[model samples]
Target: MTETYPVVKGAEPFFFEGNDIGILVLHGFTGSPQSMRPLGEAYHEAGYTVCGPRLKGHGTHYEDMEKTTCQDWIDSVEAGYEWLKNRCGTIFVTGLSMGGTLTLYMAEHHPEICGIAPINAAINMPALAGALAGVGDLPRFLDAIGSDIKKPGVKELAYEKTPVKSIGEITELMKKVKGDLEKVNCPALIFVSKEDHVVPPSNSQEIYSSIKSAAKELVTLDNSYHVATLDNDQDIIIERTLHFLQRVLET
Candidate 1:
């Protein structure tokens, strides 16, 4: 059903077939698969199958996003997860921002996940709502909050306007995920930027403390902002994630 929506150029979902170990990569709110493509390619080059799904209502148009809900976003990732499961023997998930939020959501619901890595994952609803606070009885849209990258000449492919309705849905998603944080029991790798202007770094700390996974490590990205995948620390992300994958899957 979601396929009916026309996808933007370079914003289409990607699948790189490599091996039975599958990696589901996800992008952030108002962001497209373009943001996660490099990381997905890194995984594919490491001999793992990778799928980067464009979340419902994202990468197409902001008006298209306005019609979507939290459940629709969840369904988008769930579809990707199911698709990977069919062709792969083992699965791991990773995402950025809201994509990171969805990554944790998947870990909570699907314990079969080998591990998860969530970068700048949002959890606190109040903080998020505050970031987009505006007047006029809940305006239909707000200024864009995308491309918070620290690197020069780098920008994320995201919407120019954020649908206010989408924020409400994301807030709901945060509440649900915050309550179920303790349910995530798989190995975890959490990344937080030292100076993210959007999501507070403490969100990652809270996630690290709440998740039941004993094999968890929280890494701080000093050189990047919210969109670490496209910032100066991108290589660090790719290298460390590959190391984490080897430790969990090979040994």
Candidate 2:
């Protein structure tokens, strides 16, 4: 049966359930649940319950994102997590880029999560350009430019108007989150790109170093960019993610 649940103020959550093991997927900034749709469908086809939540202010209007804070996005994820918990005995979380950051944040705050697979998640930019951009204004500029930076098969859902204030709030949230990386005790699989242009590779390195998971792995995608979830190494992304979830769920 086709179903949808309310995830944000005006949006509804989509559900695809089959078995007891569940996976929650979150998308990145200015992105929609579509970013994780393929992965979620694959998991569902494997007989696992899967839910991909549309973060607050995303998959709608760019102004909606301007009105949202990181906490709003976090709440949306928590809502998805709660939904998954009801349908499965165990829950695993994964995401691409900004989605990855949210996945890490969720693992840190919630102890029962089976594991996390974060792909090309970036915590900070190596260049001063990122620092200077400031949260509020930079994203607005980028949003206006409408640069086709996304990978193939990944539709661009970025905000047309970047809310600088919200961007600043997100930056602050990331800083707070970075400090708590050591507290995430679940198993984690981190993916990174050797030559990423959007988010610096150093961001992944730092996350890898800071997370406290006993069973952790770092995979480098040699031929992918920021949106590795839909890029050249997407199959590797799918296989490794499913394998990681299977291993963690069995534990």
Candidate 3:
């Protein structure tokens, strides 16, 4: 019983081609490409092949998203990666929240990326874990944790509600990613926010502490919530990413 939700105006998949290097940008859980599109546009203008795929059931209604599993999102990223490898030399994967979690998973599983930027990955959420625990006890949904922005009047353009059924899979995905952090063996750019309402800052710290990537850098974002990509420091992210990608493309 998979029903398709209406297409969201700003949540379409984004793609741009400029040069040999490719970058795959992913959005968060319950979120859409609308959240990652600005960042993708920046990189595209800087001369790189880029794609931001709408994950399964995303860019749609909550009931539709409730039907998707984390694996579906993984396969979507894999498809984007495959599209890039066919035409690009070096590929970089970067994302926010669950997208960040998927990026780390890709770093371990994809085998040949030059760099990865994981922003506010929900590696561990003690309170959220407790809440989702309650969700598993029943067959119901709740208000979503999307749109956690702090820049005043900014929102993430995500699901209006959250499917509790989906939380079980999201939790499973987070647990699996935490264990596989040591397997990530490429350059990593980890971003953590000082104030995050949805996922605690500890989620980002664990990835920083656990990964084996030698060329890792942890940049603390001072003025953003969980969705830092759409916050006030987005330019900071854009600038730093451009600088980091230059180093990655060179090496």
Best by lDDT: 1
Model 1 lDDT per residue over 129-176, tens place:
764675558667888888999998887899999888788889889889
Candidate number that wins on TM-score, 1 or 2: 1
For candidate 2, list the clashing residue pairs, or say none.
5-13, 136-164
**Which sequence of candidate numbers ranks them by lDDT, best first?**
1, 3, 2
Q: Each candidate's root-mean-square deviation in Å?
A: 1.7, 4.8, 1.6
lDDT of 1: 0.91
Off by over 4 Å in 3: 1-3
lDDT scores for all predictions?
A: 0.91, 0.75, 0.87
What tens digits encode model 3's per-residue C-alpha lDDT throughout 92-139?
999999999999999988778889998898887776556755533654
Give me the displacement of residue 194 in model 3, in angstroms. Answer: 0.7
Error of 1 at 236 (Å): 0.6
List, residue by residue over 1-251, the lDDT tens digit for candidate 2. 11132233323345897788888888887677765677787888888888998887776766666677888888889999999888888888998777888889999899989899988775774442254554543434434312223355544444555565566656766777788899889999998877677678888888989998999999998877776666677788889988887787667
- lDDT head-to-head 2 vs 3, winner: 3
Superposition-based RMSD of candidate 2 using all C-alpha atoms, in angstroms: 4.8
